[PDB]
Amino acid sequence: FGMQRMHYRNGDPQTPFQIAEQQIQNFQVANWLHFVNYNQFRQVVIDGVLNQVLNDNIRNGHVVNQLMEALMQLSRQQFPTMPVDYKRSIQRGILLLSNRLGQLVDLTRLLSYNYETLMACITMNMQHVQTLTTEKLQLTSVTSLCM
């Protein structure tokens, strides 16, 4: 949108999605930036077991219908000051993903079901706390899952 890049001053309670939300007056993008930051688990018991669950819109693939619109919206942003060589390579790389709507609506429809079915067999509480070490994710593996 031609905005100036921001500095974060690594300290606030506000994530970069949370700052970039009331900064943009676009409906198609700020509908998506409002889901993604208030996207968290829900703490509630069944049968004596406290478990962590999610929204309805991830349990079906309905939130991906907004990720389409928002990603598609900016696939036409003329990108001011950007060189047109690097501009066309990044606007076409988004349509690698936005043109796959029906296959990602069903992928997050399957991911939520396998998480839902396997958590029936949990006996201890699903207590949530930040672990000292961390299992590492590579975003190369996510692009390999999506495409």
CB atoms within 10 A of CB 93: 10
Q: Which of 68, 104, 108, 112 binds another protein (CB under 8 A)?
A: 68
Distance (Å, whole) CA 106 – CA 89: 27
Q: Which of 10, 76, 81, 127 binds another protein (CB under 8 A)?
A: 76
* Residues paired with residue 42 on neighbouring β-strands, in sequence order: 53
Q: Which of 36, 62, 71, 91 binds another protein (CB under 8 A)?
A: 62
* Residues paired with residue 22 on neighbouring β-strands, in sequence order: none
Q: Which of 57, 71, 87, 107 binds another protein (CB under 8 A)?
A: 57
- Under rule CB under 8 A, residue 129 binds another protein: no
Distance (Å, whole) CA 114 – CA 108: 10
Binding-site ranges for another protein (CB under 8 A): 1-3, 22-28, 31-32, 34-35, 38, 40, 42-46, 51, 53-57, 62-63, 65-66, 68-69, 76-78
